[PDB]
Design a protein around this ligand. Sequence first.
Ligand SMILES: CCCCCCCCCCCCCCCCCC(=O)OC[C@H](COP(=O)([O-])OCC[N+](C)(C)C)OC(=O)CCCCCCCCCCCCCCCCC
Ligand SMILES: CCCCCCCCCCCCCCCCCC(=O)OC[C@H](COP(=O)([O-])OCC[N+](C)(C)C)OC(=O)CCCCCCCCCCCCCCCCC
Ligand SMILES: CCCCCCCCCCCCCCCCCC(=O)OC[C@H](COP(=O)([O-])OCC[N+](C)(C)C)OC(=O)CCCCCCCCCCCCCCCCC
Ligand SMILES: CCCCCCCCCCCCCCCCCCCC(=O)O[C@H](COC(=O)CCCCCCCCCCCCCC)COP(=O)(O)OCCN
Ligand SMILES: CCCCCCCCCCCCCCCCCCCC(=O)O[C@H](COC(=O)CCCCCCCCCCCCCC)COP(=O)(O)OCCN
Ligand SMILES: CC(C)CCC[C@@H](C)[C@H]1CC[C@H]2[C@@H]3CC=C4C[C@@H](O)CC[C@]4(C)[C@H]3CC[C@]12C
Lengths: 10, 57, 350, 203
Amino acid sequence: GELNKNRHPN
Amino acid sequence: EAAFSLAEAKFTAGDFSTTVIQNVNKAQVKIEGTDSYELTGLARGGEQLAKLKRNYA
Amino acid sequence: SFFPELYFNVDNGYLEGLVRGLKAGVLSQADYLNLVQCETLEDLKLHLQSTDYGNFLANEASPLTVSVIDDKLKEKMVVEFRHMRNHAYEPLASFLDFITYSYMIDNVILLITGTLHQRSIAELVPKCHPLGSFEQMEAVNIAQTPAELYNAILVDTPLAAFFQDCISEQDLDEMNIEIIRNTLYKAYLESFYKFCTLLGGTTADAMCPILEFEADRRAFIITINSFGTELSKEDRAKLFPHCGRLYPEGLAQLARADDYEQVKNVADYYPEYKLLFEGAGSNPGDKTLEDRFFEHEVKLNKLAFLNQFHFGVFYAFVKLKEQECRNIVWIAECIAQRHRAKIDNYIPIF
Amino acid sequence: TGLELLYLGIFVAFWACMIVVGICYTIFDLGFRFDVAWFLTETSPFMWSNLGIGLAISLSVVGAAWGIYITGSSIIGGGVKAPRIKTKNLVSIIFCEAVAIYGIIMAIVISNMAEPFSATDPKAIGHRNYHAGYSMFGAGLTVGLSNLFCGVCVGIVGSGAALADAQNPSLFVKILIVEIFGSAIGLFGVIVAILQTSRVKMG
Ligand SMILES: CCCCCCCCCCCCCCCCCC(=O)OC[C@H](COP(=O)([O-])OCC[N+](C)(C)C)OC(=O)CCCCCCCCCCCCCCCCC
Ligand SMILES: CCCCCCCCCCCCCCCCCC(=O)OC[C@H](COP(=O)([O-])OCC[N+](C)(C)C)OC(=O)CCCCCCCCCCCCCCCCC
Ligand SMILES: CCCCCCCCCCCCCCCCCC(=O)OC[C@H](COP(=O)([O-])OCC[N+](C)(C)C)OC(=O)CCCCCCCCCCCCCCCCC
Ligand SMILES: CCCCCCCCCCCCCCCCCCCC(=O)O[C@H](COC(=O)CCCCCCCCCCCCCC)COP(=O)(O)OCCN
Ligand SMILES: CCCCCCCCCCCCCCCCCCCC(=O)O[C@H](COC(=O)CCCCCCCCCCCCCC)COP(=O)(O)OCCN
Ligand SMILES: CC(C)CCC[C@@H](C)[C@H]1CC[C@H]2[C@@H]3CC=C4C[C@@H](O)CC[C@]4(C)[C@H]3CC[C@]12C
């Protein structure tokens, strides 16, 4: 898992 | 086997699914070493949860 | 002696009898075998209906799932504990509140974890343990401000006393959530031990051993799990509760410990823990250290029922029913995943 | 422990006062003023006898009530899940109540020994009347306190037996024996009281 620059989870 | 290890972990560590899903932070495996779930089973989880991680890895 | 016989039943005799009656309904070994022989979760419910559980699961949907069974078991335990609490007086009420602090400590950790990661606090309540529900509205509609949440905890939560172990709200964003949880649990366990000792009499006698084992197992497992992590020894020793039987030079040796062999050497000084470590082979196919500690905890809780005029019966019943719910969920998991081989890993009670 | 603090303070103050008062009386050669004879003699035998009867009945009833509630709380708590208890364990309550009965009986056996004097001078009241008063008081104390302790003990054992019964029916029949033993003490007290007022005669 990771939260991207937009904090969108994968 | 990974699913059964997850069940065995839930036996001891309790309901850690919410804690795992909330403390996401950054990905440790990509397609890094940025571990974020260390100490999750610090008091109760311990080996089971560690084993769980290994299995899913 | 404190002569709890003369006055205990004045306020708590009815609840003593009621909680013992509830404990009489915990599945015995024969019931566990009967449930182990099931083939499908529907058959598990059938075999469970003949026990004290009855029709707690009849209403739920026919295509049963382990999550549904776990939720129903937790709901039943919560209902029973709440009914006992509502009929309890000041001292026993404080005791039961102390029991619920254990789950409030996890719920507050969930709240701060969600708030720091900017998720609505109202959306985190569903995942909180019912026994530690924050019915107070001061910690709701926080607007995702960690400082506001910390002030709410301090003002309108019994955890305010345990949050003085920290120094400021900045710690919420400074210390890892696990360290915060373990520090809160250390403070809560010390407060619980002091409360039980102040109660004295049979309560202290039958309750101090359980809290002492809790502290010792917390120390052992915090030492064992933190070997490969960044948790330094100095910061690790802060998480060891001081109630245990390891307090003089035992916790210090654990803090200096740097391997599982050294933890075993420290435990060797205490035969009751020496046996638990000896039986914990930890290799595949045999009981692990956590399972041995669970067995010892169940043994202590069961022995808590040999005393009569004490409040430790309520804590023992709560923990025994928690273990029973975990055992039933484990059996359901083994049934669903067809892993019959390990179906015997449940810890029997009575 | 505020009330406990008050009781402890009163007890300590009273007994420190008693120690200092005894020291002063002994040392100042004023012992003759500490006539225990005068206290035991001028004090009317009627006070002793009536306190004895009142205690014989009241302390027995206090023990019976103590045991009754001690065991009834457990009975009615256990019976929520095993109502059969209410049927079988009333025996415990019976034993507790039996205590009170002894009380009244001894009260009667003591109250039958009372009789006025028509005298006020200790030489006129006499050894017979003074001993009658003292022995009625002592018999009242014996029966009342023995019954109090027996009732409390039987109540504790009955609560234990009711909690045991809620989980295994075949235990009460073997635990009642303890209650029987706990009951014997009551009888003993009564016997002693009867021996204390056997040769008591006011008049
Ligand atoms: C705090 C809780 C509430 C209080 C609960 C407890 C109440 C205690 C009841 C007190 C009554 C005591 C009896 C009083 C009569 C006896 C007095 C006596 O011995 O002296 C007269 C006796 C006999 O006196 P006499 O016979 O020569 O006098 C002639 C006779 N009269 C007076 C009646 C005409 O000895 C003396 O003369 C002593 C003179 C000095 C006084 C010494 C008194 C002793 C105590 C003094 C200190 C206080 C003690 C406590 C310390 C502080 C608290 C811990
Ligand atoms: C740490 C505590 C502090 C110490 C003091 C405690 C409080 C005691 C004071 C209470 C008030 C009484 C004051 C005297 C009142 C007048 C009495 C009187 O007329 O006396 C006639 C009495 C009795 O009469 P008499 O003996 O004088 O007359 C002769 C009688 N024949 C012939 C029979 C012998 O005697 C005195 O003259 C007494 C004078 C001194 C009395 C002092 C108070 C006595 C108690 C002192 C404390 C005792 C413990 C000491 C150790 C403590 C250590 C911790
Ligand atoms: C706290 C638990 C209880 C123990 C402590 C309190 C005990 C006493 C409490 C009741 C009130 C006081 C009773 C005594 C009354 C005085 C009687 C009297 O004057 O006659 C005495 C009598 C008679 O006195 P008399 O003046 O008639 O002398 C005899 C004279 N001929 C024979 C000619 C008649 O003799 C005694 O001295 C008897 C001893 C008892 C009196 C002393 C009481 C002691 C009080 C406790 C302090 C002890 C001092 C050492 C401290 C350390 C202790 C380890
Ligand atoms: C220790 C230092 C030296 C002391 C020496 C002086 C003598 C002792 C005096 C007391 C000194 C200590 C202070 C205690 C104050 C009274 C007791 C606590 C407060 C109190 O009375 O309130 C509640 C009872 O209600 C009430 O107010 C009811 C009390 C009044 C009842 C009066 C009847 C008794 C008369 C005495 C004869 C009986 C003798 C028996 C041996 C009890 O409070 P809580 O414990 O529920 O709450 C916890 C806190 N309060
Ligand atoms: C270290 C701690 C202290 C230990 C020491 C003991 C302390 C005990 C406390 C009691 C007081 C001390 C005992 C000795 C003093 C007694 C009084 C003597 C004074 C006196 O001369 O009185 C005589 C009568 O008293 C008498 O003859 C009375 C005799 C009985 C005295 C003892 C009674 C005490 C109370 C016991 C209660 C036990 C209860 C058990 C549940 C005179 O009489 P007379 O014939 O000359 O009259 C002539 C009239 N014209
Ligand atoms: C406060 C509680 C504990 C009680 C008070 C202590 C009692 C025992 C003390 C306090 C003051 C004392 C009085 C002080 C002075 C005298 C005068 C003396 O000629 C006779 C005794 C007499 C009258 C004392 C009797 C005992 C006394 C009343």
